[PDB]
Amino acid sequence: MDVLYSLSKTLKDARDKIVEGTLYSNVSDLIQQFNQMIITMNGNEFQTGGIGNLPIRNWNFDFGLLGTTLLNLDANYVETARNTIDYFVDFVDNVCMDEMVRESQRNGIAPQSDSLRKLSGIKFKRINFDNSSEYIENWNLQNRRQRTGFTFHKPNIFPYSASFTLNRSQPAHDNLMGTMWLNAGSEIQVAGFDYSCAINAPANIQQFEHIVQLRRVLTTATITLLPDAERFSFPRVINSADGATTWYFNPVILRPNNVEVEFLLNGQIINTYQARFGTIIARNFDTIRLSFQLMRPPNMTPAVAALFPNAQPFEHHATVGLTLRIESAVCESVLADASKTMLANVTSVRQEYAIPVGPVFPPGMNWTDLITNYSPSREDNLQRVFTVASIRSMLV
Amino acid sequence: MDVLYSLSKTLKDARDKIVEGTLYSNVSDLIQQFNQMIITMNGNEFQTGGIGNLPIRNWNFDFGLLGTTLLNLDANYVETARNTIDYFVDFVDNVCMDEMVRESQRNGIAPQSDSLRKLSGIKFKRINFDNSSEYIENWNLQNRRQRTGFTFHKPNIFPYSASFTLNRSQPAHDNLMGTMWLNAGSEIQVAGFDYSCAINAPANIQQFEHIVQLRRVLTTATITLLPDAERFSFPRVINSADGATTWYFNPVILRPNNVEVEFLLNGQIINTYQARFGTIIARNFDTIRLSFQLMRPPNMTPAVAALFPNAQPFEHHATVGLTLRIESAVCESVLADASKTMLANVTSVRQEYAIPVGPVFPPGMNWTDLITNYSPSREDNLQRVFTVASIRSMLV
Amino acid sequence: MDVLYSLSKTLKDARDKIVEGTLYSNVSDLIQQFNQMIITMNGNEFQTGGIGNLPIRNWNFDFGLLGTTLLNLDANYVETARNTIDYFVDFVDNVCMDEMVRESQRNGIAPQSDSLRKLSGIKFKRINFDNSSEYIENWNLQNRRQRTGFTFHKPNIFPYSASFTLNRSQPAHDNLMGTMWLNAGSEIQVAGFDYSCAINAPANIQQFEHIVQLRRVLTTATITLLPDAERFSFPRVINSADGATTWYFNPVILRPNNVEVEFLLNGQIINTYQARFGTIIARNFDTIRLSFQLMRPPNMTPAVAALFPNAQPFEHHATVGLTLRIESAVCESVLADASKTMLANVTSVRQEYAIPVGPVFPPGMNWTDLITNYSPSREDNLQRVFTVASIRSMLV
Amino acid sequence: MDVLYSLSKTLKDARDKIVEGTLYSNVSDLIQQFNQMIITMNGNEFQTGGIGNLPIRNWNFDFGLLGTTLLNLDANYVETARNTIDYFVDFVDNVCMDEMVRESQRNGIAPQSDSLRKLSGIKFKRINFDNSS
Amino acid sequence: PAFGMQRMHYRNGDPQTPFQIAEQQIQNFQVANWLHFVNNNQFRQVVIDGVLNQVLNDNIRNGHVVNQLMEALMQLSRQQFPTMPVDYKRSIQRGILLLSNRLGQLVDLTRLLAYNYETLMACITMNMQHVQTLTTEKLQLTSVTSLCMLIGNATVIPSPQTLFHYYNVNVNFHSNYNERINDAVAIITAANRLNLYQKKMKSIVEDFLKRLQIFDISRVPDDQMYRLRDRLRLLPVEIRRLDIFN
Ligand SMILES: [Zn+2]
Ligand SMILES: [Zn+2]
Ligand SMILES: [Zn+2]
Ligand SMILES: [Zn+2]
């Protein structure tokens, strides 16, 4: 992995720094590293691609080196370097694609392709140089078992889940009390609804709770908390819990009462925010517990009083909502996010070459299933393929 | 940990090999390693702390080397070696005890005692030699991020739970359909009972399902599956789900029908066994799904027909069972098993010196609580303490 | 097999002993053995796989020797050794997997995979060194035709069979005399039942006998014998012998009378135990004969006399039992047991790679089928695969 | 701040670039900067304070220079560098945490913790190098 | 012998040199890395100001690779030489240390040699074509030992007048070469276009070689003379001479 990353980094630096007219002192170390890469790869035979529609490709290296005494690079030097750079970039891209389409249950962190396995040999270690990318840094630290985390903008930590729970219900679904939520990406929209508007509830308060268990621990997370759930604020016709019938929801939004957000780790209260909206910080947590309340307005104007009678029928249904958005976070494991393209790259490579479904990942590289059952083996394979995808994106 | 294990291993080898009359060629390498340990430890001051009732102990090393002059070891040589080995064994045992009684939520895998933290310095790396124990092997593999394996005979993977679920029930508890199970250690005994004997079932079949989620992934597991659950095959008086009353259970055991034992990983079917009993193999799984059926006997002799009427009262209640014992398995994480004494050693050390409850483990070293909430922090601390316990058991 | 085991043992020793900071005197002989392995394996091409889903893998060996002079091992030495050991361990694991999935009716003890056949050549005999494991030791002894002994904790010697015999029966199944048994793993539960409680039997005694013929001779066996069979002591609805109908069993447990456990070899009584319960020793036997009597109590209290009338109907059926558990034993043939993982390892390797059913073992390596027809060819193939599985377990 | 940032940057560069097998030409200037940092920090005593529950920590620097004279970095070099880098990274993280938890109404742009105030002396200015963040 | 390895049975004509085999067969990092460099330290080709130049690895120019050499041979000084007689082993190790302890002098010597080579190569005007010549310059390894063991720290670089003289001689030789090529081509083309079929181009080629001033024409193989004639025939005539001929 480090050798493949070093190949990609050397090729990127050759594209960027080996330019016409540049001082040789601007590229001396880069030229030395490039010549080391040529020397190491020369005389070695590689084979990539025997899975899905990824065609078999054979790679031989018999390239020449680059000069070392000129004072400024010229067009001849760049032309000499460009063909080698193109061939090496093609080889690296094919190796990355070969490794991205492979998985195993036993050792998903170890290389799977033949080319990357050969590059794991000691002789290729000479190609290794600056490992400065976030993913390669995390790879190296994690191999040593050091505390290292990936930073995500809008981490995709919540598997898709649009569900409801009815604490009070009956066949006609005209007097319901419960919660409906959407868990999607970095977003939780929860809405507790009472059809009776807590007319008979103790102290005219109805309590709603929503617990979301994250499959991985998020640290140093910035959260935007708002007191309404726009998703559950308009009339809806919703299937029954068994799909036998459809019920009606006609929300009227009351502000949530006694809003408490508890970010917990291993069942311990790490962060607690009461009646706080806007930006909050959850430093370390694996569970989010949102507790809110619908309180009857003790004083109602004639229209508000008309909305909520003393008894059935309840035509307007009181609703309180909360919206939670993880703007950024840090996780020790790799996750899909709105800023990176690692999941997109891996999925694209697997789809373009019709890779048969393996024994680790769900078919089609579905992220909802992947994060629903994010096992250690799945974490290993995902980290491997994501690191390879970042390496490839360095050039492609 | 490697240095502490090497100290213990050197001391064990000295105890086993430095015996009266033995050829020096039988101990030459052992004597060299022992003298290397003496040189490395000399001039160093160690302290084992006073956590709990553990006495604060100070250790000074000013020992001379073991001789190399005797063709065969005599009594005087053995006595001098015994003196030095006794001091070193006392030191190592105290260090192991001081490490076992400590835990950390942040870095539970790292050393917690100051003596072991000092032994983790580079100057002590010379002491390190052969690491052939399973626990130290797994420690070193884990440090390098390699596939770890602990082999357990009768692993204690299931937290204790004797519970029941009533799918059909009523206040008088005379027409009950449900399941009662015991999950304890490596054993599961589940029993589905129908009081009506599936008289009104869609096809005279009552389906029972039991899902047991393992807190860790088990691999290469030998499992004995037997039809009957002897634990739920005799009359019982059982508390109600809320403890408000007690109900009567009067099982009559019928052969389980359409037995399907599924061993699932990430929700996917890894192993399936239909109507198979005896020894089976589950190669890799984290969940067990036992599906069975109470099938009304289509033909009944007069007594059997007498047992099961067409309506209430139901005096005899049809019960189908299943017993699932995990004889042996392999887990990437440490676990308590019927063979090893790591949990017993750690618990005994903690109870002897009245160690206050820490922030990681349950307040008795209780295994049910530990395995119920087997968090990564708990796993790290448990691996550390179990490795130290094995190191101590080499000597004590 | 000895060469493959020696490769695995050398690699295990290299992993355990070649560690940073260790004295070179702790590894000198190991380093020489490792260098001999490298020399012998150099310049040889191997191929593994090509069966089932096991991938084809080619192995070429061109490695240098470890000739660096040091007092204590450093990081450079450990890294070089690690690279070589990683390649060799991968090769050995693949060879073991290839050999574990193959079988032959003729010469099933001989190597089946091409890699092991090539490793059986004379030129590789130099790799051979210490053969200390139980399975390789037994392999070598058997090749020499000296007695080989496999020690088993809870040997899996009894194929699963939950059966019954009705010595007296009628279509109504209301006056039955017979025996029902479960012979599973190392456990034999037997229960002789008389519905009439021997009211009309001579001397008011009914005699039951249970003969269990072991497929292989067991020696130095520790047996726990308990008076009662808990498995056959609760109300039960049992299918008819031909499945036409179902009958009812309502045990009342009387202690067995005149209990004689005979352990027989070639039909000759080797061991006899009369009215002895607890721990007993069967030194050499191939058959177990459990003879026990249901004796009608000469004196009964009014509650007891109420259960056993002079004539039908018989509502309570007098049952005597016996439980026989083989805790430990020694067999000249390999067997599955509760402590080892060789059967599990072979089954897992065959299931993971979808090995087609062969001409020797039953589908899925079902242990009940294998031990029910434990033919000499099956025994040879099973010993081969179990030895290979242990060799692999040393590394994987 | 510039000295603390330069310490962190040097350590990050050392962790990223000092890897087994790499050409010394890839790290020559990095090794020079690392040795300059070691020379400047050697013999100095630092203390990260006990504000709140942050533990009081004492830091002593007595480290040998990173070696030259290798064409490609080997495992011994990387191991020694990793030991030194681990200690320095722990020190820098503790200093950053100690500075992050303090504040003053006036002169709040100036360093608050004792460690960073010490690092703001002239003698540590030698550690300062590329400020690109 | 240092690493206790069986002596190499090297086969002549092997595409790998002995050091290339040793690099793979030796596990020690110091010696293996030095062997790798020695294997891959061939000249690099670069065109400067239109002149092809054979340039050295940057590690030779700065002399840093000598450290690696030192590293490698320092390891050789610590080796056991398992079966070697101990006095001969001591002598070999002490010679290895004799070379090792001159690390600074050898780095200085390498830098001086590389700098002198670059400075004098700046004065070369014809392409530095690398060809395995028929005869060689015999270099005594005892002279190499003398240079290694006797070099001090007195930097000696080419004098500016020496550089100018070298450049002038190279320019004069190159210009004379081109002018005599032009004369030969012009005369050959004129003879062909004048239909002088009895003219012998051999005499023209001999005069051309004689005017090159560095050839004893009596020892030029005939096949090479005729190849020279053909190649001269294929060239186009210089503009001034061609206009005069027209
Ligand atoms: Zn509903
Ligand atoms: Zn109940
Ligand atoms: Zn047991
Ligand atoms: Zn029957």
Q: Which residues contact A238 (CB under 8 A, 6 or more apart)?
A: A164, A180, A246, A247, A248, A249
Strand, helix or coil for residue D49: coil
What is the C-alpha separation between A263 and A269, in angstroms, rounded?
6
With beta carbons under 8 A apart, name residues in chain E contacting A72: none
With beta carbons under 8 A apart, name residues in chain A contacting D13: 132
- The reply, when asked if residue C286 is annotated as ligand binding, is yes
Q: Which amino acid is at B7?
A: L
Sign of the Cα torsion C275, C280, C282, C286 reads: positive
Nearest C-alpha in D relative to C73: D76
Helix and strand numbers (H, E) in chain A are 9, 14
CB A179 within 8 Å of CB A208: yes
Burial of A254 (0-12, 13-18, 19+ CB in 10 A): buried
Neighbours of chain D (3+ CB pairs under 8 A): A, C, E
What is the C-alpha separation between C100 and C396, in angstroms, rounded?
14
Burial of C135 (0-12, 13-18, 19+ CB in 10 A): buried
Nearest C-alpha in B relative to C370: B279
What is the C-alpha separation between D97 and D76, in angstroms, rounded?
32
With beta carbons under 8 A apart, name residues in chain B contacting A109: 145
What is the C-alpha separation between B271 and C348, in angstroms, rounded?
10
By DSSP bridging, strand E51-55 and strand E44-48 are antiparallel
**What DSSP line would sit under chain E, residue for residue?**
-TT-PPPP---TT-SS-HHHHHHHHB--HHHHHHHHHHHH-PPEEEEETTEEEEE--HHHHTTTHHHHHHHHHHHHHH---TTS-HHHHHHHHHHHHHHHTTHHHHHHHHHHHHHHHHHHHTT--S-------SS-----HHHHHHHHHH--S------HHHHHHHHHHHHHHHHHHHHHHHHHHHHHHHHHHTT-TT--HHHHHHHHHHHTSS--GGGS-HHHHHHHHHHHHHSPPPHHHHHHH-
What is the C-alpha separation between A286 and A263, in angstroms, rounded?
7
The structure tokens listed for B261 are 């034992």
Q: Which ligand is nearest to the CA of B328?
A: 3
> What contacts 24+ positions apart, CB below 8 Å, involve C204-208?
C204/C295, C204/C296, C204/C298, C205/C257, C205/C258, C205/C293, C205/C294, C205/C295, C205/C296, C206/C177, C206/C293, C206/C294, C207/C291, C207/C292, C207/C293, C208/C179, C208/C291, C208/C292, C208/C293, C208/C294, C208/C320
Query: What letter does residue C230 receive in the DSSP assignment?
Result: G
Q: Report the DSSP beta bridge partners of residue D60.
A: D45
Neighbours of chain C (3+ CB pairs under 8 A): A, B, D, E
Backbone angles phi and psi of A166, in degrees to 5: -105, 115
Q: Which amino acid is at C66?
A: L
What is the C-alpha separation between D132 and D117, in angstroms, rounded?
22
What is the C-alpha separation between B232 and B225, in angstroms, rounded?
16
By DSSP bridging, strand C150-153 and strand C317-331 are antiparallel
What is the least distance, in Å, from the CA of C232 to any CA of chain B?
A: 9
CB B331 within 8 Å of CB B386: no
Helix (H) or strand (E) holding C168: strand C158-168
Strand, helix or coil for residue A131: coil
SS3 sequence of B25-58: HHCHHHHHHHHHHHHHHCCCEEEECCCCCCCCEE
Q: Given in angstroms, what resolution was this structure solved at?
A: 2.7
Of B134, B225, B154, nearest to C154 by C-alpha is B154
CB C9 within 8 Å of CB C130: yes
With beta carbons under 8 A apart, name residues in chain A contacting D19: 2, 128-131, 140
Neighbours of chain B (3+ CB pairs under 8 A): A, C
What is the C-alpha separation between C70 and A204, in angstroms, rounded?
82
If you count residue pairs, one on A and one on E, with CB atoms under 8 Å apart, how many are there? 40
What is the least distance, in Å, from the CA of C375 to any CA of chain B?
A: 19
CA distances from A394 to A136, A388, A390 (A): 12, 10, 6
Helix (H) or strand (E) holding B179: strand B177-185
Preceding amide of B313 cis, omega within 30: yes
What is the C-alpha separation between A327 and A324, in angstroms, rounded?
9
What is the C-alpha separation between B40 and B32, in angstroms, rounded?
12
Exposed e or buried b per residue across B244-263, where buried means at least 16 C-beta atoms within 10 angstroms of its C-beta: eeebebebbbbbbbebebbb
What is the C-alpha separation between C351 and C371, in angstroms, rounded?
19
Longest C-alpha distance within chain B, in Å? 94
Sign of the Cα torsion A42, A44, A45, A50 reads: negative
End-to-end CA distance of chain B: 17
Judge whether D72 is closer than 8 Å to chain C, CB to CB.
Answer: no
Q: Which residues contact A163 (CB under 8 A, 6 or more apart)?
A: A180, A181
Judge whether B362 is closer than 8 Å to chain C, CB to CB.
Answer: no
Q: Quick check: A68 and E40 CB within 8 A?
A: no
Sign of the Cα torsion B26, B30, B34, B36 reads: positive
Of C395, C394, C391, nearest to C100 by C-alpha is C391
The structure tokens listed for A253 are 């939004």
Half-sphere exposure of D88 (CA within 13 A, CB side): 29
Q: How far is the CA of A167 from the centre of ligand 2 (A)?
A: 20
What is the C-alpha separation between E3 and E75, in angstroms, rounded?
10
Q: How was this structure determined?
A: cryo-EM
The structure tokens listed for E49 are 């100001």
User: H-type helices in chain B, by residue range?
Assistant: 2-17, 28-41, 75-100, 114-119, 134-143, 302-307, 342-352, 367-372, 376-395
Q: Which residues contact E55 (CB under 8 A, 6 or more apart)?
A: A67, A68, A69, A70, E43, E44, E45, E46, E118, E121
Query: What letter does residue A69 receive in the DSSP assignment?
Result: S
With beta carbons under 8 A apart, name residues in chain D contacting E68: 69-71
Strand, helix or coil for residue A85: helix
Helix (H) or strand (E) holding D83: helix D75-100
Q: Which amino acid is at A288?
A: I
What is the C-alpha separation between D101 and D51, in angstroms, rounded?
8
Judge whether C316 is closer than 8 Å to chain B, CB to CB.
Answer: no
Of B260, B283, B281, B279, nearest to B270 by C-alpha is B283
Residues 3-62 of A with CB under 8 A from D: 28-29, 32-33, 36
Strand, helix or coil for residue C23: strand
Q: Which residues contact C378 (CB under 8 A, 6 or more apart)?
A: C108, C360, C361, C370
Helix (H) or strand (E) holding A370: helix A367-372
What is the C-alpha separation between C169 and B262, in angstroms, rounded?
39
With beta carbons under 8 A apart, name residues in chain C contacting B255: 237-239
Preceding amide of A313 cis, omega within 30: yes
Backbone angles phi and psi of D35, in degrees to 5: -65, -35
Preceding amide of E85 cis, omega within 30: no
Exposed e or buried b per residue across B270-307, where buried means at least 16 C-beta atoms within 10 angstroms of its C-beta: bbebeebbbbbbbbbbbbbbbbbbbbbbeebbebbeeb
CB B235 within 8 Å of CB B194: no
Q: Report the DSSP beta bridge partners of residue E55.
A: E44
Strand, helix or coil for residue B153: strand
Q: Quick check: B284 and A105 CB within 8 A?
A: yes
Give residue for tokens 């480090």. Answer: A2
Strand, helix or coil for residue B387: helix
**What DSSP line would sit under C63-107, residue for residue?**
--B-----SB--HHHHHHHHHHHHHHHHHHHHHHHHHHT---SSS
CA distances from B153 to A295, B289, B335 (A): 57, 22, 10
Number of other residues whose CB lies within 10 A of the CB of residue C315: 15
What is the least distance, in Å, from the CA of D3 to any CA of chain A?
A: 21
Number of other residues whose CB lies within 10 A of the CB of residue B123: 12
- The reply, when asked if residue B194 is annotated as ligand binding, is no
Helices E141-150 and E103-121 pack at an angle, to 10 degrees, of: 110
CA distances from A291 to A157, A263, A387, B92, C35 (A): 21, 12, 39, 51, 67
Strand, helix or coil for residue C42: coil
Strand, helix or coil for residue C160: strand
What is the C-alpha separation between C86 and B146, in angstroms, rounded?
11
What is the C-alpha separation between B297 and B373, in angstroms, rounded?
43
Sign of the Cα torsion A25, A27, A30, A36 reads: negative
User: H-type helices in B101-215, by residue range?
Assistant: 114-119, 134-143
**What DSSP line would sit under A268-287, residue for residue?**
EEEEEEES--EEEEEEEEEE
CB D39 within 8 Å of CB D66: no
Strand, helix or coil for residue A246: strand
Give residue for tokens 């190949």. Answer: A7
Sign of the Cα torsion E92, E94, E100, E102 reads: negative
Strand, helix or coil for residue A6: helix
Q: Report the DSSP beta bridge partners of residue A46.
A: A59
Q: Which residues contact C332 (CB under 8 A, 6 or more apart)?
A: C147, C148, C149, C150, C216, C217, C219
Q: What's the Rg (C-alpha) of chain A?
A: 28
Query: What letter does residue A106 receive in the DSSP assignment?
Result: S
What is the C-alpha separation between A29 and B58, in angstroms, rounded?
54
- The reply, when asked if residue A258 is annotated as ligand binding, is no
Backbone angles phi and psi of B193, in degrees to 5: -120, 140
Nearest C-alpha in A relative to C87: A121
CB B345 within 8 Å of CB B337: no
CB A79 within 8 Å of CB A385: no
Helix (H) or strand (E) holding B284: strand B278-295
What is the C-alpha separation between A112 and A114, in angstroms, rounded?
7
What is the C-alpha separation between C121 and B350, in angstroms, rounded?
56
CB C150 within 8 Å of CB C134: yes
What is the C-alpha separation between A285 and E13, in angstroms, rounded?
68
Judge whether C244 is closer than 8 Å to chain B, CB to CB.
Answer: yes
